[PDB]
Coordinates of C-alpha atoms in Angstrom, one line a residue:
Chain A
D11 CA 28.2 52.1 30.8
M12 CA 30.0 50.8 27.7
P13 CA 28.2 51.3 24.4
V14 CA 29.6 49.4 21.4
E15 CA 28.5 52.4 19.2
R16 CA 31.1 54.6 20.9
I17 CA 33.8 51.9 20.5
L18 CA 32.9 51.6 16.7
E19 CA 33.2 55.4 16.5
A20 CA 36.7 55.2 18.1
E21 CA 37.8 52.7 15.3
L22 CA 36.3 54.8 12.5
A23 CA 37.9 58.0 13.8
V24 CA 41.4 56.6 13.4
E25 CA 41.2 54.9 10.0
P26 CA 44.0 56.0 7.6
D45 CA 63.9 46.5 3.8
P46 CA 60.6 45.4 5.4
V47 CA 61.7 45.6 9.0
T48 CA 62.5 49.3 8.6
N49 CA 59.1 49.9 7.0
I50 CA 57.2 48.0 9.7
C51 CA 59.0 50.1 12.4
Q52 CA 58.3 53.5 10.8
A53 CA 54.6 52.5 10.4
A54 CA 54.6 51.4 14.1
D55 CA 56.0 54.7 15.4
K56 CA 53.4 56.6 13.4
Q57 CA 50.6 54.4 14.7
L58 CA 51.6 55.0 18.3
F59 CA 50.4 58.6 18.0
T60 CA 47.1 57.4 16.6
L61 CA 46.9 54.8 19.4
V62 CA 46.8 57.6 22.0
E63 CA 44.0 59.3 20.1
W64 CA 42.0 56.0 19.9
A65 CA 42.4 55.3 23.6
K66 CA 41.0 58.7 24.6
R67 CA 37.8 57.9 22.6
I68 CA 37.2 54.6 24.5
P69 CA 34.6 55.3 27.2
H70 CA 35.9 56.0 30.7
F71 CA 39.6 55.7 29.8
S72 CA 40.4 59.4 30.1
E73 CA 38.7 59.5 33.6
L74 CA 41.3 57.0 34.9
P75 CA 44.3 58.5 36.8
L76 CA 47.0 59.7 34.4
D77 CA 49.5 57.2 35.8
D78 CA 47.1 54.3 35.1
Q79 CA 46.4 55.5 31.5
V80 CA 50.2 55.4 31.1
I81 CA 50.5 51.9 32.6
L82 CA 47.7 50.5 30.4
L83 CA 49.1 51.9 27.1
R84 CA 52.7 50.7 27.9
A85 CA 51.4 47.2 28.7
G86 CA 49.0 46.9 25.7
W87 CA 50.5 48.9 22.8
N88 CA 52.1 46.0 20.8
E89 CA 49.0 43.8 20.9
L90 CA 46.7 46.7 20.0
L91 CA 48.9 47.5 16.9
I92 CA 49.0 43.9 15.8
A93 CA 45.2 43.6 16.1
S94 CA 44.8 46.7 13.8
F95 CA 47.2 45.7 11.0
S96 CA 45.8 42.1 10.9
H97 CA 42.2 43.2 10.5
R98 CA 43.2 45.9 8.0
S99 CA 44.8 43.0 5.9
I100 CA 41.9 40.6 5.6
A101 CA 41.2 41.2 1.8
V102 CA 44.9 40.9 1.2
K103 CA 46.4 37.6 -0.2
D104 CA 49.4 36.3 1.8
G105 CA 50.4 39.8 3.0
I106 CA 49.9 42.8 5.3
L107 CA 48.6 46.3 4.7
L108 CA 50.6 48.9 6.6
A109 CA 49.1 52.2 7.7
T110 CA 51.6 53.9 5.5
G111 CA 49.8 52.5 2.4
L112 CA 52.6 49.9 1.7
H113 CA 51.7 46.2 1.3
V114 CA 54.3 43.7 2.6
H115 CA 54.0 40.2 1.1
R116 CA 55.0 36.8 2.6
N117 CA 58.0 36.3 0.3
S118 CA 59.4 39.7 1.2
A119 CA 59.2 38.9 5.0
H120 CA 60.7 35.5 4.3
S121 CA 63.7 36.9 2.6
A122 CA 64.4 39.5 5.4
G123 CA 64.7 36.6 7.9
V124 CA 61.3 37.3 9.6
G125 CA 59.1 34.8 7.7
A126 CA 58.2 32.7 10.8
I127 CA 56.5 35.5 12.8
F128 CA 54.9 36.9 9.6
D129 CA 53.3 33.6 8.8
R130 CA 51.9 33.3 12.4
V131 CA 50.1 36.6 12.0
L132 CA 48.8 35.4 8.6
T133 CA 47.5 32.0 9.7
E134 CA 46.5 32.7 13.3
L135 CA 45.0 36.1 13.0
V136 CA 44.5 37.4 9.4
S137 CA 43.1 34.2 7.9
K138 CA 40.8 33.6 10.9
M139 CA 39.5 37.2 10.9
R140 CA 38.8 36.7 7.2
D141 CA 37.1 33.3 7.5
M142 CA 34.6 34.5 10.2
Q143 CA 34.2 38.0 8.8
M144 CA 35.2 39.7 12.0
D145 CA 33.7 43.2 11.8
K146 CA 35.0 46.6 13.1
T147 CA 32.8 46.7 16.2
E148 CA 34.0 43.2 17.2
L149 CA 37.7 44.3 16.6
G150 CA 37.2 47.5 18.6
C151 CA 35.8 45.6 21.5
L152 CA 38.6 43.1 21.5
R153 CA 41.1 46.0 21.5
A154 CA 39.2 47.7 24.4
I155 CA 39.4 44.4 26.3
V156 CA 43.1 44.4 25.7
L157 CA 43.4 48.0 26.7
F158 CA 41.6 47.5 30.1
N159 CA 44.1 44.8 31.3
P160 CA 43.6 44.5 35.1
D161 CA 46.8 42.4 35.3
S162 CA 49.0 45.4 34.4
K163 CA 51.7 46.0 37.1
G164 CA 51.6 49.1 39.2
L165 CA 47.9 50.0 38.8
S166 CA 46.5 52.2 41.6
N167 CA 43.1 50.5 41.3
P168 CA 43.1 47.2 39.4
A169 CA 39.4 46.6 40.4
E170 CA 38.3 49.7 38.4
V171 CA 40.1 48.4 35.3
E172 CA 38.6 44.9 35.7
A173 CA 35.1 46.5 36.0
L174 CA 35.7 48.4 32.7
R175 CA 36.9 45.1 31.1
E176 CA 33.7 43.3 32.3
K177 CA 31.5 46.1 30.7
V178 CA 33.2 45.8 27.3
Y179 CA 32.8 42.0 27.0
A180 CA 29.1 42.2 28.3
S181 CA 28.4 44.7 25.6
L182 CA 30.3 42.5 23.0
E183 CA 28.4 39.4 23.9
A184 CA 25.1 41.2 23.5
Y185 CA 26.2 42.7 20.1
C186 CA 27.2 39.2 18.7
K187 CA 23.9 37.6 19.9
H188 CA 21.9 40.3 18.1
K189 CA 23.9 40.8 14.9
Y190 CA 24.8 37.1 14.4
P191 CA 22.0 35.1 16.1
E192 CA 22.7 32.0 13.9
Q193 CA 26.3 31.7 15.2
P194 CA 26.0 30.9 19.0
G195 CA 29.8 30.2 19.4
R196 CA 31.0 33.5 17.9
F197 CA 31.6 35.4 21.1
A198 CA 33.9 32.7 22.5
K199 CA 35.5 32.4 19.1
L200 CA 36.5 36.1 19.3
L201 CA 37.9 35.9 22.9
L202 CA 39.9 32.7 21.8
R203 CA 42.1 34.7 19.4
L204 CA 43.4 36.6 22.4
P205 CA 45.9 34.0 23.5
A206 CA 47.4 33.8 20.0
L207 CA 47.5 37.7 20.0
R208 CA 49.4 37.6 23.3
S209 CA 52.0 35.1 22.1
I210 CA 52.6 36.9 18.8
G211 CA 52.9 40.2 20.7
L212 CA 55.6 38.7 22.9
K213 CA 57.6 37.3 19.9
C214 CA 57.4 40.7 18.1
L215 CA 58.8 42.4 21.2
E216 CA 61.8 40.0 21.2
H217 CA 62.5 40.9 17.5
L218 CA 62.2 44.7 18.2
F219 CA 64.8 44.4 21.0
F220 CA 67.1 42.6 18.6
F221 CA 66.6 45.3 15.9
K222 CA 67.4 47.9 18.5
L223 CA 70.6 45.9 19.3
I224 CA 71.7 45.4 15.7
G225 CA 71.2 49.1 15.0
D226 CA 71.4 49.2 11.2
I229 CA 64.0 53.2 15.4
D230 CA 62.1 56.4 15.9
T231 CA 61.5 58.1 19.2
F232 CA 58.0 57.0 20.3
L233 CA 58.6 53.3 19.5
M234 CA 62.0 53.7 21.3
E235 CA 60.2 55.1 24.4
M236 CA 57.8 52.1 24.4
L237 CA 60.9 49.8 24.4
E238 CA 62.5 51.7 27.4
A239 CA 62.6 50.2 30.9
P240 CA 59.8 51.4 33.2
Chain B
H2 CA 58.1 58.4 29.4
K3 CA 57.7 62.0 28.2
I4 CA 56.1 61.5 24.8
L5 CA 53.2 59.4 26.1
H6 CA 52.7 61.7 29.0
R7 CA 52.6 64.9 26.9
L8 CA 50.1 63.3 24.5
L9 CA 47.8 62.1 27.3
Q10 CA 47.8 65.5 29.0
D11 CA 46.8 67.3 25.7
Chain C
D11 CA 29.8 14.9 21.7
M12 CA 31.7 16.5 24.6
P13 CA 30.2 15.8 28.0
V14 CA 31.6 17.8 30.9
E15 CA 31.0 14.8 33.2
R16 CA 33.7 12.8 31.3
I17 CA 36.1 15.8 31.5
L18 CA 35.5 16.0 35.3
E19 CA 36.2 12.2 35.5
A20 CA 39.5 12.8 33.7
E21 CA 40.5 15.4 36.3
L22 CA 39.5 13.2 39.3
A23 CA 41.3 10.2 37.9
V24 CA 44.7 12.0 37.9
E25 CA 44.5 13.6 41.4
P26 CA 47.6 12.8 43.6
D45 CA 66.6 24.3 46.0
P46 CA 63.1 25.1 44.7
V47 CA 63.9 25.0 40.9
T48 CA 65.2 21.4 41.3
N49 CA 61.9 20.5 43.1
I50 CA 59.7 22.2 40.5
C51 CA 61.5 20.2 37.8
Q52 CA 61.3 16.8 39.4
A53 CA 57.6 17.4 40.0
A54 CA 57.1 18.5 36.4
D55 CA 58.8 15.3 35.0
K56 CA 56.6 13.1 37.1
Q57 CA 53.5 15.1 36.0
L58 CA 54.3 14.6 32.3
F59 CA 53.5 10.8 32.7
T60 CA 50.2 11.7 34.4
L61 CA 49.4 14.3 31.6
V62 CA 49.4 11.5 29.0
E63 CA 47.0 9.5 31.1
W64 CA 44.7 12.5 31.5
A65 CA 44.7 13.3 27.7
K66 CA 43.6 9.8 26.9
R67 CA 40.5 10.2 29.1
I68 CA 39.4 13.4 27.2
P69 CA 36.7 12.4 24.7
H70 CA 37.9 11.9 21.1
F71 CA 41.6 12.6 21.8
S72 CA 42.7 8.9 21.4
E73 CA 40.8 8.7 18.1
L74 CA 43.1 11.4 16.5
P75 CA 46.0 10.2 14.4
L76 CA 49.0 9.3 16.6
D77 CA 51.1 12.1 15.0
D78 CA 48.5 14.7 15.9
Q79 CA 48.2 13.5 19.5
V80 CA 52.0 14.0 19.7
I81 CA 51.8 17.5 18.2
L82 CA 49.1 18.6 20.6
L83 CA 50.8 17.4 23.7
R84 CA 54.2 18.9 22.8
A85 CA 52.5 22.2 22.1
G86 CA 50.3 22.3 25.2
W87 CA 52.2 20.5 28.0
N88 CA 53.6 23.5 29.9
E89 CA 50.3 25.4 30.0
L90 CA 48.4 22.3 31.0
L91 CA 50.8 21.7 34.0
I92 CA 50.7 25.4 35.1
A93 CA 46.9 25.3 35.1
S94 CA 46.9 22.2 37.4
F95 CA 49.4 23.4 40.0
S96 CA 47.7 26.8 40.2
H97 CA 44.3 25.3 40.9
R98 CA 45.7 22.8 43.3
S99 CA 47.2 25.8 45.3
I100 CA 44.0 27.9 45.8
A101 CA 43.7 27.2 49.6
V102 CA 47.4 28.0 50.0
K103 CA 48.6 31.4 51.2
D104 CA 51.3 33.0 49.1
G105 CA 52.6 29.6 47.8
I106 CA 52.3 26.6 45.5
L107 CA 51.3 23.0 46.2
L108 CA 53.5 20.6 44.1
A109 CA 52.2 17.1 43.1
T110 CA 55.1 15.7 45.2
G111 CA 53.4 16.9 48.4
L112 CA 55.9 19.8 48.9
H113 CA 54.7 23.4 49.4
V114 CA 56.9 26.1 47.8
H115 CA 56.3 29.6 49.4
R116 CA 56.9 33.1 47.9
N117 CA 60.0 33.9 49.9
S118 CA 61.6 30.7 48.9
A119 CA 61.1 31.4 45.2
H120 CA 62.2 35.0 45.7
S121 CA 65.5 33.9 47.2
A122 CA 66.2 31.4 44.4
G123 CA 66.0 34.2 41.9
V124 CA 62.6 33.2 40.4
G125 CA 60.3 35.5 42.5
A126 CA 59.0 37.5 39.5
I127 CA 57.5 34.5 37.6
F128 CA 56.3 32.9 40.8
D129 CA 54.4 36.1 41.8
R130 CA 52.7 36.2 38.3
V131 CA 51.3 32.7 38.8
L132 CA 50.1 33.8 42.3
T133 CA 48.4 37.0 41.3
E134 CA 47.2 36.3 37.8
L135 CA 46.1 32.6 38.2
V136 CA 46.0 31.4 41.8
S137 CA 44.3 34.4 43.4
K138 CA 41.8 34.8 40.6
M139 CA 40.9 31.1 40.7
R140 CA 40.4 31.5 44.5
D141 CA 38.3 34.7 44.3
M142 CA 35.8 33.2 41.7
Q143 CA 35.9 29.7 43.2
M144 CA 36.8 28.1 39.9
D145 CA 35.7 24.4 40.2
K146 CA 37.3 21.2 38.8
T147 CA 34.9 20.9 35.9
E148 CA 35.7 24.4 34.8
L149 CA 39.4 23.7 35.2
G150 CA 39.1 20.5 33.1
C151 CA 37.3 22.3 30.3
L152 CA 39.9 25.1 30.2
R153 CA 42.6 22.4 30.0
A154 CA 40.8 20.5 27.3
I155 CA 40.4 23.8 25.3
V156 CA 44.2 24.2 25.7
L157 CA 44.8 20.6 24.6
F158 CA 42.7 21.0 21.4
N159 CA 44.8 23.9 20.0
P160 CA 44.0 24.1 16.3
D161 CA 46.9 26.6 15.8
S162 CA 49.5 23.8 16.5
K163 CA 52.0 23.5 13.7
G164 CA 52.1 20.3 11.5
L165 CA 48.6 19.0 12.3
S166 CA 47.2 16.7 9.5
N167 CA 43.7 18.1 10.0
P168 CA 43.4 21.4 12.0
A169 CA 39.7 21.6 11.3
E170 CA 39.1 18.3 13.3
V171 CA 40.9 19.8 16.3
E172 CA 39.0 23.1 16.0
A173 CA 35.7 21.2 16.0
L174 CA 36.7 19.4 19.2
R175 CA 37.7 22.8 20.8
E176 CA 34.3 24.3 19.8
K177 CA 32.5 21.3 21.5
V178 CA 34.4 21.8 24.8
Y179 CA 33.6 25.4 25.1
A180 CA 29.9 24.9 24.1
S181 CA 29.6 22.3 26.9
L182 CA 31.5 24.7 29.3
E183 CA 29.2 27.6 28.5
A184 CA 26.1 25.5 29.2
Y185 CA 27.6 24.2 32.5
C186 CA 28.3 27.7 33.8
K187 CA 24.8 29.0 32.9
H188 CA 23.3 26.1 34.8
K189 CA 25.5 25.8 37.9
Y190 CA 26.1 29.6 38.3
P191 CA 23.0 31.3 36.8
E192 CA 23.5 34.4 38.9
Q193 CA 27.0 35.1 37.4
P194 CA 26.3 35.8 33.6
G195 CA 30.0 36.9 33.0
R196 CA 31.6 33.8 34.4
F197 CA 32.1 31.9 31.1
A198 CA 34.0 34.9 29.6
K199 CA 35.9 35.4 32.9
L200 CA 37.2 31.8 32.5
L201 CA 38.3 32.2 28.9
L202 CA 40.0 35.4 29.8
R203 CA 42.6 33.7 32.0
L204 CA 43.9 32.0 28.9
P205 CA 46.0 34.9 27.7
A206 CA 47.7 35.1 31.1
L207 CA 48.2 31.4 31.0
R208 CA 49.9 31.6 27.6
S209 CA 52.3 34.4 28.6
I210 CA 53.3 32.7 31.9
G211 CA 53.8 29.4 29.9
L212 CA 56.2 31.2 27.5
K213 CA 58.2 32.8 30.4
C214 CA 58.5 29.4 32.2
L215 CA 59.9 27.8 29.0
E216 CA 62.6 30.5 28.8
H217 CA 63.6 29.7 32.4
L218 CA 63.7 26.0 31.7
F219 CA 66.0 26.4 28.7
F220 CA 68.3 28.5 31.0
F221 CA 68.2 25.8 33.7
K222 CA 69.1 23.3 31.0
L223 CA 72.0 25.6 30.0
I224 CA 73.4 26.2 33.5
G225 CA 73.3 22.5 34.2
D226 CA 73.8 22.4 38.0
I229 CA 66.6 17.7 34.4
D230 CA 65.0 14.3 34.0
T231 CA 64.3 12.5 30.7
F232 CA 60.6 13.2 29.9
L233 CA 60.9 17.0 30.7
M234 CA 64.2 16.9 28.7
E235 CA 62.4 15.3 25.6
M236 CA 59.7 18.1 25.9
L237 CA 62.5 20.7 25.6
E238 CA 64.1 19.0 22.6
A239 CA 63.8 20.4 19.1
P240 CA 60.9 19.0 17.0
Chain D
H2 CA 60.2 11.8 20.8
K3 CA 60.3 8.2 22.0
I4 CA 58.9 8.5 25.6
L5 CA 55.7 10.4 24.5
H6 CA 55.3 8.0 21.6
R7 CA 55.7 4.8 23.6
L8 CA 53.2 6.1 26.2
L9 CA 50.6 7.1 23.6
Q10 CA 50.8 3.7 21.9
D11 CA 50.3 1.8 25.3

């Protein structure tokens, strides 16, 4: 059973140079991510090794989803969990304008235009958490079944809250490929920042080899 | 992966 | 209007060391890709510059989707459009086993298990074709509207052909993030093969800077 | 991008 009310509760429970600031905020949010995951139904019942696999595979996309949705009332910028706003022009002059703009146009602006709500966000993140394609999983079919339950609950919530928007459910799922590509590009940048070492311990562990 | 482990345990 | 019958027609109209073989096949399939795109309703009515943008953004994912679905009755291998089967062990001993295995487990095996059919494939590809996030588009809203029409037509086709599988529509859309990540990894490999030049002209043009 | 252009034109 996968009630959207519990998923909402999970989101509400965790509510709080530019590359340095982004990194500090990300490290801090990794601790919060663990607390969020434990509130998603059935996750803590998975074998410890699997919980580890799922969080190491999904962490960067889960973090991107949160700061994008947090930033929807923000013009041309991003609200970090630390309370700091990072604007376009600031990211452009640090040499990271391209990736910043992708987040803004592909995620933030589209979340704003449709008024994606916090239950919808939480469900998308729970779907990303329960990724059955994660390597090493002791039972991928158990994770797939939990994924199926989240998106069945999501589809029923959209059809009830927004009955006049029949395409909304698909519209939500169709931000996930953008999220995946932006997550991959962010990882490349983080490995470069690690290399040109001018990064705190939890973020560092997430960038370690398995 | 000690930090993630310790946090998942309690 | 976006009838799944026309999309099916488009698919049926185009029906036909390992890295060298994969590349030759890909070049050949690029010509076929253009012919396929012109059969997808409303695509040829888009401004020429936009048609170019959409094909340059989507080509690698469109090709991956086709060879994966072509390979579903194949054990641990891939059927190329040239008639040649490439097996696991062959890809492993050419140093490309990792990416090959991802295609097999994330795409081929999941297409097989659900019996994804050719109308479903064609719709997923048309959705990938009409990507409103493509940079430079003169009217992104026109492309988004064509995307919306494909997936509305797809949802109605699944609910009619497979009424006993309510999750099938979402299951289809949820292979798209895997497709995006595998498409990105393939591109990295192709740029390396271009670099260690031991590649035909259309594939080469697709790898050129915009 | 000449090849793609020529093919899209006819």
